[PDB]
Amino acid sequence: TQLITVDEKLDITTLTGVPEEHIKTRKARIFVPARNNMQSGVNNTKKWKMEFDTRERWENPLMGWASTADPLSNLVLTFSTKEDAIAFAEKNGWSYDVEERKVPKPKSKSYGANFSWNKRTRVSTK
Amino acid sequence: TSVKPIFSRDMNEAKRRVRELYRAWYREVPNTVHLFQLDISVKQGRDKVREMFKKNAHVTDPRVVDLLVIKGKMELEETINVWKQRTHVMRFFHETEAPRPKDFLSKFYVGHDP
Amino acid sequence: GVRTSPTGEKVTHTGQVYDDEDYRRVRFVGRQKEVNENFAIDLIAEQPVSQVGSRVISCDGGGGALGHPRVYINLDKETKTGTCGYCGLQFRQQH
Amino acid sequence: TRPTVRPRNDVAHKQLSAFGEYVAEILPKYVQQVQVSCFSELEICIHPDGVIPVLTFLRDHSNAQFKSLADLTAVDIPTRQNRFEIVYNLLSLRFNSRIRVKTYTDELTPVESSVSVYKAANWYEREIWDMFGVFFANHPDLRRILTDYGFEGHPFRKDFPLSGYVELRYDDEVKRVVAEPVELAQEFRKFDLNSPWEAFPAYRQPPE
Amino acid sequence: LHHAVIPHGKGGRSSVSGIVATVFGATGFLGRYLVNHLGRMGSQVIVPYRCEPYDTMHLRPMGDLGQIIFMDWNGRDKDSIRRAVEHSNVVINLVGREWETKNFDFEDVFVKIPQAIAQVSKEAGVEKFIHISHLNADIKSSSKYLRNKAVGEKEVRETFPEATIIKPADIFGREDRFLNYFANIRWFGGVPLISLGKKTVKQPVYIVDVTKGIINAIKDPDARGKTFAFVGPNRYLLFDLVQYVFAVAHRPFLPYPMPHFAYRWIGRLFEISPFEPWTTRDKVERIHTTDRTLPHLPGLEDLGVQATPLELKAIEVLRRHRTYRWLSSEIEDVQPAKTV
Amino acid sequence: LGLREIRIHLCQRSPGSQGVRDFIEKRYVELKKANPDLPILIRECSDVQPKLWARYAFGQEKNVSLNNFSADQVTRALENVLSSKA
Amino acid sequence: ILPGAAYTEKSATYVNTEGRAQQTKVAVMPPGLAREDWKIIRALSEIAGMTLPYDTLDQVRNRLEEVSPNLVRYDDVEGANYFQQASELSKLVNQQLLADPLVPPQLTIKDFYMTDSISRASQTMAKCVKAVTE
Ligand SMILES: NC(=O)C1=CN([C@@H]2O[C@H](COP(=O)(O)OP(=O)(O)OC[C@H]3O[C@@H](n4cnc5c(N)ncnc54)[C@H](OP(=O)(O)O)[C@@H]3O)[C@@H](O)[C@H]2O)C=CC1
Ligand SMILES: [Zn+2]
């Protein structure tokens, strides 16, 4: 036979070694990262990402540094599709919220529209 | 839904392996209190073994509980052989940590964590 | 030109000084608050404004490769001197 | 392209292509993909049931003789449904050659241990248990090798954070080295360094 | 409430607990575990030390960087106390001696120094001042220790109105002089007592419970002006207590009574050298002094601290004295001492 | 002590809210004139089951499932809410 | 005074003028002892003895769904029909139009940069007002 049939849910929360507080009380976020509007390049809007909620950063009294207690504060995971991220978050027991992929709609670009006859879209200078 | 097992074909053999592991830990605990010369009683160590087994009493997947039995026997191999020390055994007793606020009101009083 | 707070504590060139009720002065109890008494904003005020007859002046801070990258400064504003963004040496066109 | 660009070895590329065809058609039961990179290295991407029949082949076939197990490796890629990727780097001292044998697993599927082929793997896949949680069935002494004895979790998985979950300190009350939950005096600062411009058009993927 | 002392973090090591503590006498037995429990919350702990700085080395891993500030002081110097307590929001005093010396007798250590510390903490605006007296403090007491400590308690109260005064009965731990006093009299001849030590009744208290009570009194605003009496959960006689001490240590026990006729003279027999005296006549008068029961004063359970008995920690204290032939033994070996 | 507000959840495209829509096109206006200072919050959503939340005094909220009902059944349930006043 | 949280400083559902409910994400934490707003209100209910049936933010949003389910359905404009019935309810009582002409409170660029408690406490907005009054 050399196979079994597991009808139950794929769940590995007892195996990862993560404490319970960083399983149930966190909120994973599954999102295509938004385009840095400083830059027209769109290679940062390709792959899905999973972050978590940002917990407390406080002042270190010695140096003024950003001390923190959240271990998962720097954990940003990369997933090629959305449902892989959803299956990964269901697999680890993380409660997740999903933003959809915001794509720009195609615009009607016309260079002659800058020099129309009766339309308002004449440019005032070039 | 056809996956490959580890040791157990279903939940009954898996519970058999959990039960043999519990038998082995229950035999091991008096020697663990003795040779490590811990400062707890034997009954307190058996209570901690009971708590660590009841922590994972919710899983209905045979591969996950097979891996839990494998990891528990690795813990037992590191316990029978003196590979762990007094510190690694007493890490199961979260003693130096303060008890965390459990109710909403004291968590509201001390911090931002829900 | 370091100035001293009313609590008796020196003030850095940033302006950082602990308040009177702040407990974090206790790290200086029996010890010293190390500040540098050569303020950069006061040592750059002492530099003379360089008169040139050009319209655009190039500055690398002196030393060639031992200074900063060579940048070009416009001096069309007869009101305001052209301060270098790296070294702070300010230039004025003499016309 | 003479001074800076690396000189391409086309002879080794053709020879590894021919040997990859050779291995792909001798073992069609397990071999999924065969690929040769630009710098002429061969990968035989196989099925995880074929750990023993491939590696015993390459160790014992007279045209392969991959006698030395150089490096056994796991790679965590969480976007795949079999996230862990087991890599066998093999050296044939007879034919002066190097091959790579790659396969897959998830957290729960046991990979067949290769100590009956290469005893060199006796620690390596043990490390793959210690770092990745990949279980290896019929291993002689499978346990942790690199982490602390009471350490909970598998560190080199990518869902495991850089700093752990517990840290140590000596405690004078209990006169003992204890583990508290980890707190940093300074947070590990994350540098978002990905340039938003496509660096390599040759590795462009087709869109959805 | 200044912004730098606002409590942050999860209460771990590198957090900000909002407590700035000047712990006088932190180099001793109680101050060790007090700085241990304060620095694991992330408290600014000022340690004024009198001794060699090497004897403060064990205080350095007890907290995060910049959370312990070591500084010199003199007992007869109000300038050093003003230099120390001026930034703190709590001052805990722990200066004590089991014996009187050439330079410091009991009137200096218990009456003069805590009154000076509390006066300087008052005129520098310190919010909380905690004093550690002894449960058997009595003006009419037969021992100089308890008389001077009751006088100093009265003076700490009358110069600091919100002083939290704490009465431990008999503190035991790894570095105590209560169970280690009992366990290190074996080769002297058979543990001498008055009337076989069965006319005095004690209830010892454990040092982690004392420390939890002190720190939960730091964090309680309702402990201002109160007077606490930290006692154990069970009251023993002295004889069955020494029975239980030598029975946990797995030692032979051959007692004999020792009356007034020469057991006050073993004091002047055993401080003949200028070292630490192994026993003194004040320690004689205090071992054979029963612990009073004060129901009106609050205790550990009125601060939410569970009093841990001796049958859980006596093995931890007294495993050091077992030779080798009963080192590897169990806690289920000794039948416990009878309560009263 | 009495009814304080009514909430009516429904949908635009679901047939299960259909008679509930037939309650609002025909029988809401003379409802609102009969209850001048009773807030009756009509909430249209994407795929919810229809619902009748009746909040009473001291935060007591009672729940009626208006799924797949006709206009007369929704009218009878709402007038039983108006008549009961728990 | 109960010190609350700000929009960068809490996870929080705001609904724009078109009905599209949208959640903010926690960027930083509130300064000092200041806590999140509904945390404060829920703890006040726990003090007074009128404890509300929610403990976590998801339970607040389940209550918020019970009030209206178009508050927890994010980036979604739920189309609101029944203009005719609101019109027929509008024609009941004739309130009369005043002869004061319609003047907005924000006539020029002077009146834009200081509207709420955050903008009036801003030195950038203060420089903007000082630089548009000249
Ligand atoms: N069984 C007990 O321990 C009990 C103790 N107490 C009280 O609790 C307090 C702490 O007890 P404990 O730690 O065990 O005693 P210790 O003698 O071990 O500790 C006393 C501390 O105060 C310092 N100190 C002592 N004498 C002087 C002095 N003359 N001038 C300046 N500093 C001095 C010591 O430092 P240094 O090395 O410089 O001397 C040390 O840090 C004391 O006030 C004691 O009376 C009350 C009830 C029971
Ligand atoms: Zn320059």
CA distances from E76 to B11, E81, E102, E113, G33 (A): 75, 9, 15, 7, 41
Beta strands C56-59 and C71-74: pairing type? antiparallel
D64 neighbors D92 (Cβ within 8 angstroms): yes
Rounded to whole angstroms, the Cα distance separating G129 from G126 reads 5
Task: Tell me which residue in E5, E72, E83 faces C23 most closely, judged by beta carbons.
Answer: E5
Q: How many helices (H) and strands (E) does chain F have?
A: 3, 4
- Chain D residues touching residue A34 (CB < 8 angstroms): none
E248 neighbors E334 (Cβ within 8 angstroms): yes
Q: Is the CB–ligand 1 distance for residue E173 below 6 Å?
A: no
CB atoms within 10 A of CB D199: 8
Residue G25 CA, ligand 2 centroid: distance in Å: 43
Reading the block at residue E212, the tokens are: 């939890």
Q: Tell if the CB–CB gap between B67 and D171 is shorter than 8 Å.
A: no
CA distances from C70 to C44, C59, C66 (A): 19, 5, 11
User: What does the radius of gyration of chain C's CA atoms come to, in whole angstroms?
Assistant: 20
Residue D120's identity, in one-letter code, is A
Reading the block at residue E278, the tokens are: 């192994």
Residue G57 three-state SS: helix
3-class SS letters over chain C: CCCECCCCCECCCCCCCCCCCCHHHHHHCCCCCCCCCCCHHHHCCCCCCEEECCCEEEECCCCHHHCCCCEEEECCCCCCCEECCCCCCEEEECC
Sole residue written with tokens 């139009």: G97
**Subunits touching G (CB < 8 Å, at least 3 pairs)?**
A, B, E, F
How far is A115 from chain G, CA to nearest CA, in Å?
A: 32
Dihedral angle over CA of D20, D26, D27, D32, nearest 10: 40
D138 neighbors D113 (Cβ within 8 angstroms): yes
Residue C26 CA, ligand 2 centroid: distance in Å: 41
Residue C42 CA, ligand 2 centroid: distance in Å: 17
**Helix or strand (DSSP H, E) at F33:** helix F29-34
Residue C91 CA, ligand 2 centroid: distance in Å: 10
Length of chain E equals 340
Q: Which of E29, E47, E148 gets mutated to test ligand 1 (max ligand atoms within 8 A of its CB)?
A: E29
Q: State the closest ligand 1 atom to the C-alpha of E101, by its place in the atom list counted from 1.
A: 29
Reading the block at residue F81, the tokens are: 């809410």
- Chain E residues touching residue B34 (CB < 8 angstroms): 328, 330
F67 neighbors F14 (Cβ within 8 angstroms): no
> Which domain range does residue A16 map to?
1-126
Reading the block at residue F25, the tokens are: 């096109």
Nearest CA owner, ligand 1 atom 42 = E96
In terms of C-beta density within 10 A (0-12 exposed, 13-18 middle, 19 or more buried), how is residue D13 classed?
Answer: middle
Which residues 6+ apart lie within 8 Å of B71 measured at CB? A15
Residue D86 three-state SS: strand
Residue of B nearest to E8 (CA): B111
A113 neighbors A119 (Cβ within 8 angstroms): yes
Rounded to whole angstroms, the Cα distance separating D144 from D129 reads 7
Interface with B, mutate which of A2, A4, A57, A58 (most B CBs under 10 A) = A4
Per-domain residue ranges of chain F: 1-86
In what order do the strands lie in the sheet containing A95-98? A77-79, A48-51, A27-31, A95-98
Provide the experimental method for this PDB entry. cryo-EM
Rounded to whole angstroms, the Cα distance separating E300 from D187 reads 39
**CB contact burial D157-169 (16+ within 10 A = b; e otherwise):** bebbbebbbbbeb
Confirm or reject contact between F28 and chain G (CB < 8 A). Answer: yes
Residue D128 three-state SS: helix
**CB contact burial D170-182 (16+ within 10 A = b; e otherwise):** ebbbbebebbbbb
Beta strands E128-132 and E90-93: pairing type? parallel
Reading the block at residue E303, the tokens are: 């601060």
Q: Tell if the CB–CB gap between B111 and E315 is shorter than 8 Å.
A: no
Rounded to whole angstroms, the Cα distance separating D42 from D55 reads 15
> Which domain range does residue B94 map to?
1-114
3-class SS letters over G83-110: HHHHHHHHCCCCCCCCCCCCCCCCCCHH
Sole residue written with tokens 């020469």: E262
Query: Are F and G close enough to touch, i.e. 3+ CB pairs under 8 angstroms?
Result: yes
Interface of E with G (CB under 8 A): 3, 6-7
Residue of A nearest to E13 (CA): A69
Reading the block at residue A122, the tokens are: 């004449």
E90 closest CA partner among E130, E39, E122: E130
Rounded to whole angstroms, the Cα distance separating B9 from E145 reads 74
Which residues 6+ apart lie within 8 Å of B57 measured at CB? none
A7 neighbors B5 (Cβ within 8 angstroms): no
Dihedral angle over CA of C8, C13, C14, C19, nearest 10: 0
Rounded to whole angstroms, the Cα distance separating A40 from E188 reads 89
D177 neighbors D168 (Cβ within 8 angstroms): yes
Rounded to whole angstroms, the Cα distance separating C35 from A17 reads 47
3-class SS letters over B47-64: HHHHHHHHCCCCCCCHHH
Confirm or reject contact between D180 and chain E (CB < 8 A). Answer: yes
Residue D88 three-state SS: strand
Residue D112 three-state SS: strand
Rounded to whole angstroms, the Cα distance separating C36 from C57 reads 32
Sole residue written with tokens 């300064």: G31
* Number of domains observed in the structure of chain A: 1
Q: Which residues pair with E69 in a beta bridge?
A: E46
Reading the block at residue G108, the tokens are: 């020029």
Q: Is the CB–ligand 1 distance for residue E51 below 6 Å?
A: yes
Which residues 6+ apart lie within 8 Å of E195 measured at CB? E257
* Number of domains observed in the structure of chain B: 1
Rounded to whole angstroms, the Cα distance separating A55 from A60 reads 16
Which residues 6+ apart lie within 8 Å of E278 measured at CB? E184, E270
Q: Which of E24, E27, E130 gets mutated to test ligand 1 (max ligand atoms within 8 A of its CB)?
A: E27
Q: Which of E22, E47, E97 gets mutated to test ligand 1 (max ligand atoms within 8 A of its CB)?
A: E97
- Phi and psi, residue E177, nearest 5°: -125, 35
DSSP 8-state code for residue A114: G
DSSP 8-state code for residue B100: P
Residue G115's identity, in one-letter code, is T
D143 neighbors B73 (Cβ within 8 angstroms): no
Rounded to whole angstroms, the Cα distance separating E275 from E278 reads 9
Rounded to whole angstroms, the Cα distance separating E64 from E86 reads 22
CA distances from E50 to E70, E73, E106, E133, E258 (A): 10, 6, 17, 20, 38
CA distances from A102 to A32, F1, G17 (A): 8, 50, 21
Q: Residue E119: how many CA atoms within 13 Å on its side-chain side?
A: 12
Q: Tell if the CB–CB gap between G28 and A57 is shorter than 8 Å.
A: yes
Rounded to whole angstroms, the Cα distance separating A79 from D76 reads 12
Sole residue written with tokens 């690199």: D146
**Helix or strand (DSSP H, E) at A27:** strand A27-31
Expressed in Å, this structure's resolution amounts to 3.4
User: What does the radius of gyration of chain B's CA atoms come to, in whole angstroms?
Assistant: 18
- Chain A residues touching residue B114 (CB < 8 angstroms): 25
How far is B67 from chain D, CA to nearest CA, in Å?
A: 8
Rounded to whole angstroms, the Cα distance separating E99 from E104 reads 9
CB atoms within 10 A of CB D32: 14
Sole residue written with tokens 């509130």: G30
CB atoms within 10 A of CB G108: 8
SS3 content of chain F, % helix, strand, coil (to 5): 40, 30, 30
DSSP 8-state code for residue A71: G
Reading the block at residue G11, the tokens are: 């996870």
Tell me how far the alpha carbon of residue E23 is from its chain's centroid: 13
Reading the block at residue B90, the tokens are: 């007493």
Looking at chain A, after which residues does the C atom sit over 2.5 Å from the next written N, breaking the chain?
Answer: none
Dihedral angle over CA of B44, B47, B48, B51, nearest 10: -160
E132 closest CA partner among E152, E103, E106: E152
3-class SS letters over chain E: CCHHHCCCCCCCCCCCCCCEEEEECCCCHHHHHHHHHHHCCCCEEEEEECCCHHHHHHHHHHCCCCCEEEEECCCCCHHHHHHHHCCCCEEEECCCCCCCCCCCCHHHHHHHHHHHHHHHHHHCCCCEEEEECCCCCCCCCCCHHHHHHHHHHHHHHHHCCCEEEEEECCEECCCCCCHHHHHCCCCCCCCEECHHHCCCEECCEEHHHHHHHHHHHHCCHHHCCCEEEECCCCCEEHHHHHHHHHHHCCCCCCCEECCHHHHCHHHHHCCCCCCCCCCCHHHHHHHCCCCCCCCCCCCCCCCCCCCCCHHHCHHHHHHHHCCCCCCCCCCCCCCCCCEC
How far is E5 from chain G, CA to nearest CA, in Å?
A: 9
CB atoms within 10 A of CB B29: 19
- Chain A residues touching residue E16 (CB < 8 angstroms): 58-59, 61
User: What region does G49 belong to: left with phi over 0, alpha with psi -120 to 50, or beta?
Assistant: left
C86 neighbors C59 (Cβ within 8 angstroms): yes
Rounded to whole angstroms, the Cα distance separating B97 from B94 reads 6
Looking at chain B, after which residues does the C atom sit over 2.5 Å from the next written N, breaking the chain?
Answer: none
Residue C1 CA, ligand 2 centroid: distance in Å: 24
User: What region does E44 belong to: left with phi over 0, alpha with psi -120 to 50, or beta?
Assistant: beta
CB atoms within 10 A of CB E300: 24
Rounded to whole angstroms, the Cα distance separating E263 from E108 reads 27
D67 neighbors D93 (Cβ within 8 angstroms): yes
Reading the block at residue B109, the tokens are: 């009083």
Residue E81 CA, ligand 1 centroid: distance in Å: 17
Rounded to whole angstroms, the Cα distance separating B21 from B49 reads 11
Say how many Å lie between the first and final Cα of chain F, rounded: 6
Rounded to whole angstroms, the Cα distance separating C19 from C9 reads 9
Which residues 6+ apart lie within 8 Å of G109 measured at CB? G132
* Number of domains observed in the structure of chain E: 1
Which residues 6+ apart lie within 8 Å of B55 measured at CB? A14
C86 neighbors C69 (Cβ within 8 angstroms): yes
Tell me how far the alpha carbon of residue C14 is from its chain's centroid: 11
Residue G131 three-state SS: helix
E27 closest CA partner among E70, E78, E79: E70
Q: Which residues pair with C57 in a beta bridge?
A: C73
Confirm or reject contact between D150 and chain A (CB < 8 A). Answer: no
Output the furthest CA–CA distance in chain F (Å, rounded): 37
Q: Residue G76: how many CA atoms within 13 Å on its side-chain side?
A: 14
Residue C51 CA, ligand 2 centroid: distance in Å: 15
D176 closest CA partner among E323, B94, E328: B94
Which residues 6+ apart lie within 8 Å of C38 measured at CB? none
Reading the block at residue E5, the tokens are: 């002392």
Rounded to whole angstroms, the Cα distance separating D135 from D109 reads 7
Rounded to whole angstroms, the Cα distance separating A75 from D162 reads 8
Residue E248's identity, in one-letter code, is V
Residue D80's identity, in one-letter code, is R
A90 closest CA partner among A26, A11, A32, A6: A11
Q: Is the CB–ligand 1 distance for residue E31 below 6 Å?
A: yes
Q: State the closest ligand 1 atom to the C-alpha of E49, by its place in the atom list counted from 1.
A: 38
CB atoms within 10 A of CB D156: 15
DSSP 8-state code for residue D154: -
Beta strands E90-93 and E192-193: pairing type? unpaired
